[PDB]
Design an enzyme around this catalytic site. Sequence first.
Site, short mmCIF file in Angstrom:
data_model
loop_
_atom_site.label_atom_id
_atom_site.label_comp_id
_atom_site.label_asym_id
_atom_site.label_seq_id
_atom_site.Cartn_x
_atom_site.Cartn_y
_atom_site.Cartn_z
N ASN A 207 0.81 -1.22 0.00
CA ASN A 207 0.00 0.00 0.00
C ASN A 207 0.84 1.26 0.00
OD1 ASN A 207 0.85 -0.35 2.82
ND2 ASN A 207 -0.57 1.35 3.27
N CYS B 294 1.58 3.12 2.42
CA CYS B 294 2.44 3.27 3.62
C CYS B 294 3.40 2.10 3.87
CB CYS B 294 1.61 3.59 4.84
SG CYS B 294 1.01 5.29 4.80
N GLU C 148 2.96 -1.02 4.74
CA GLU C 148 2.68 -2.07 5.72
C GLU C 148 1.74 -3.17 5.24
OE1 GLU C 148 -0.91 0.52 6.75
OE2 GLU C 148 0.90 0.57 5.53
#
Lengths: 657, 657
Positions: free
Chosen positions: A344, A346, A348
């Site tokens: 994604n 970010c 994670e």
Amino acid sequence: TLAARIAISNLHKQTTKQFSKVVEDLYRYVNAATGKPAPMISDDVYNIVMENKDKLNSAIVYDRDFQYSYFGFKTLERSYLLRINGQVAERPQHLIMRVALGIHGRDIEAALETYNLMSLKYFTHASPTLFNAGTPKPQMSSCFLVAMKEDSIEGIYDTLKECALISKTAGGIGLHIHNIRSTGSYIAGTNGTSNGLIPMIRVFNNTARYVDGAFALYLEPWHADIFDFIDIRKNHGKEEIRARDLFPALWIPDLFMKRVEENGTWTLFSPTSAPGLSDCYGDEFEALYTRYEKEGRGKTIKAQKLWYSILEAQTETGTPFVVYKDACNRKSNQKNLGVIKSSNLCCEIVEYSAPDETAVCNLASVALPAFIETSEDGKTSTYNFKKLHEIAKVVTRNLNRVIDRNYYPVEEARKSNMRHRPIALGVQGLADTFMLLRLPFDSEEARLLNIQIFETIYHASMEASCELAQKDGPYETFQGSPASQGILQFDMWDQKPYGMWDWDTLRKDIMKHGVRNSLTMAPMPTASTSQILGYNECFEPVTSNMYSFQVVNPYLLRDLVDLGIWDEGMKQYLITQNGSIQGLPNVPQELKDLYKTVWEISQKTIINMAADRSVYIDQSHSLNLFLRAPTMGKLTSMHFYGWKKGLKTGMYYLRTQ
Amino acid sequence: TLAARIAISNLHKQTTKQFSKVVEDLYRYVNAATGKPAPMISDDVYNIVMENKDKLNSAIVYDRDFQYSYFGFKTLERSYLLRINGQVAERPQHLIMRVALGIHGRDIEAALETYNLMSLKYFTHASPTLFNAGTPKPQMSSCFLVAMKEDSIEGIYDTLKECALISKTAGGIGLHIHNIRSTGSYIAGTNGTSNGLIPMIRVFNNTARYVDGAFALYLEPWHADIFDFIDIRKNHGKEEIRARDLFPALWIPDLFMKRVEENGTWTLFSPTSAPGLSDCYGDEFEALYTRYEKEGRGKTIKAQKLWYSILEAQTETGTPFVVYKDACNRKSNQKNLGVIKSSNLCCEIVEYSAPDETAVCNLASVALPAFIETSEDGKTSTYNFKKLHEIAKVVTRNLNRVIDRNYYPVEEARKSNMRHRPIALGVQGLADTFMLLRLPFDSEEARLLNIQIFETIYHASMEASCELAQKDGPYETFQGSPASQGILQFDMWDQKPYGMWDWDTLRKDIMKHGVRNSLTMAPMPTASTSQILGYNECFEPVTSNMYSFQVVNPYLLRDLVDLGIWDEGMKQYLITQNGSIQGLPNVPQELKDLYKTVWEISQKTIINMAADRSVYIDQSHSLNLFLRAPTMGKLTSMHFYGWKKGLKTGMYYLRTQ
């Protein structure tokens, strides 16, 4: 810091006190400017409140509104607490109750408990959940992992349509584009020459600007357009060849890393010429990649030319991000679904996506410091691993309810979430926890606390998830998953669990009953929600002991005053040295060691701690890297060190200067 | 001018002579670079040629390849004649035969006749027809009129998808956007404030750049975003507020023109607040517009503020174009379908479009000079109106076949073309025709030749179309059309036909048998195809008597030499004065009058001639305006003069300097 009493206290009284009455007002709100009713509460959640108003109104301890920090409250004030007409209508407690009910529906017990644990700051939910829970269109989920549907105008524009619908309701998008034709490939439909990824990126950047909203793009490094792709955020370069809002991410297969190490060759392909590469990994990927390589289907280059370019982009822009395709695929419980093609925005989330399944992030985070206890005779703090395990069971259940009561802006997102039911718990205030317990981040103690904390959250969520599988059945897709064979996350790291909790029993129950969630853990950024609770971002150490609007680490200055060395000669040098206390004439070594800045912590230690905890992470986690005086060789050994630890996310940002 | 013999002659011999053999080669072509077969002939057209090779090969008079002018041939050479491998494979005659067969299929007679008339330069087909006829994906049609599907992300992006699919195969798009929300309107889906048309325009401009391709945008002047819309092509202004490839067109209702004249008020609306405006015209439009105006649903301004802005844009950029919504709707045979919401990129097509019907332009043009005849005893030229009427019947039939054998890039375009079957004949070499016949453009003779020429083409096409309705039935939609009631085009101009042809009979047949085409005439630009045949663009007078690469009007210099005044003292001043011969010391008044430049012709005359011929134009025609020393008042009276003549297209470009 006393200004926060008056900030809360005053806006505590510009506000109706009866919770039901605020719901009424919000339920009833009308857009004066247009005479359209603008309900800010859902029919569903309104009725529940009315049918329960006494239990609900008198459950609310309005004192807890002072449990919020300096700018902690002002963050809520700014963007989270619902507003009637430019003016803040909800108190913090109303927000929490609304969110609680928004999650829990008729289950007034569950709602009440979540209200309590949240209000006492044991955990919280992601921003979208806090904004949207309990409202007419309850979009409670942060980001979305989107597949590029097909390499054709129809597929591109359907994908673009999808991202527009999603980007409307905001929320992050991770889009993988491995299947898109590269610059100069033959076009059947008319004449040849595609113009490649950049012009298409440009369409996405334009469509993102139009509707909003950050956009992450995922690409394997054998794509023929790779060099331009990694500069999507560089300044100089060319005119019609970038984008000021998209974040490029590499989806790196092992073979690439090896080719660099061995100082060998690397081959760039258009997917049209080398079909299938993104649809396998590990040994199978290498067999097919090499074959394609010997069949002269691409353009061979020196692996280190590319590698040096990657390093340059990262040095200048902090990107592209680096996520390891094979670690992600080998060590995922979703491996029965197919090959996972991206993470994604970010870095994670590692969940499966496809033209008809858009994976969803369902996030909430636990406040690690809230489990610290003085308990037992004297001046000693311990950590209550029983109370952590418990809260993590609560949050696991919430996030299941979120899966079900969420509003999905596109059908692909609903298909994926309903079918595989992945969940993503995280954490905040790791750094705080360490400091509270007097443990330096690099301490052997902190190292061991890291492991235990994560063992208990994984253990807790898997147990809670198995419980739900008993009540409601396994997720649709559980049959033939690593978990169904009794292979849990740490098993895939070829390791034995640290053993604080009993894994045998749980493993026996899982094999027997299933789990409700394909996945459970993804320690995320939490920039915004960890400001609400007054904690350091997540699982990273503090970047400074000073913040801008001139605030010092609460644990640090307390210590300074207890030793009575806290004065103005000191106050000054804290500003002087980007919030560092190393090299301070009169500051105890125990403080220097405890209150080290992330620029002062060995990145080898950070990678190790990330590697240690990684064996209990279902998914991945957002590992920022911090380099002082950055050199190519230093960056190179940090990527490779992470790579060889088996990390999935070797790097999120590269933060430097 | 002798260099064209060697240009043809040499490339006449770098080329296989047997037509069937060229078809073979083209049929067989393989993309060496990729080893993909790249057939440049269709299965269908190949088989026909093989099954007919002798009749076909020996029909071809290869001498006709010298019937092409200086750069006439070089235009074919550059972009039209198919190439085997960077090299020109088709001769001109092969192109024509291919096109002929591409139109006519098994109908070898029709094919052979079209081959002849085309090769003798009596008429031609539009560029896309010349490129694509007879090829695997035979897209023979120029432009497309597209509806904006709905005012929502889904509708916008489906429309965008449609334009991308269309823009792929190139070809012009006229998109009307009257239904799109304006800057600041409430959004239900999340929070309010739309950002208006410009940001959305920007998405279309980006998507056009990505796939290619000119884009025309159609807007009614009560749209609240109108001021920015008309500057879409201005230089200075702001940063994130234009587009360097889109052509703005106004779709002007009468009420607007009146409000300006009366120096009154004009009201801007968002369509969300004032629904339906684009879906009515004339009296009904005015009743609904006024009501909305009295209900205070908009922002009132001075009609002349807007009007002055329009004039400014036009003065600087030559746009926006001006097309009159009510003249178009009142005087259209498609009026039974619904309200027509736009014209095309070139301002000649006025056809109905809707979310599921994308109107198509089916174009070909007649070479007006090819009907001039010396006939009867002596030095006198006449015009053979019988031979014109005939050719126009041939071209009408071709364009019907084109409707059927065309490849449609999107289903909306197929729905519209199959259902209403509109056709668009045009013309080239009006100016030539006049000059050949010794008639000044402003002559009373030219005025009357204009009318007759257009009466015969309308008469011819309607007759030919009625013939087809007998063979194959009326178009689906004919019942309840002006034509079905015996109301033909000139009737809607409240006029009697000039009467050279017998309209009663035809009208009687039409009422009785129907017609195959909802529409038939749209005199178009023809910039490219009229260079192929060596003629002045269309129905406009010559812009110069000199072209760049230093060529003089063939009729002018001939005259100069016949009077023996053609020398170097003369050659010089032709360059001297942008190809004007007025004010030339030794040049006969009969020449000055005959060889006037379009900057020297009364625009009142041009409007009149356009008005005269307009009564025989089913659709509209591309009326460029030419102003020397342009003033607001001069532009104002030219718009209004056209407006009051009842013109549909009051202005295409404003060409100035």
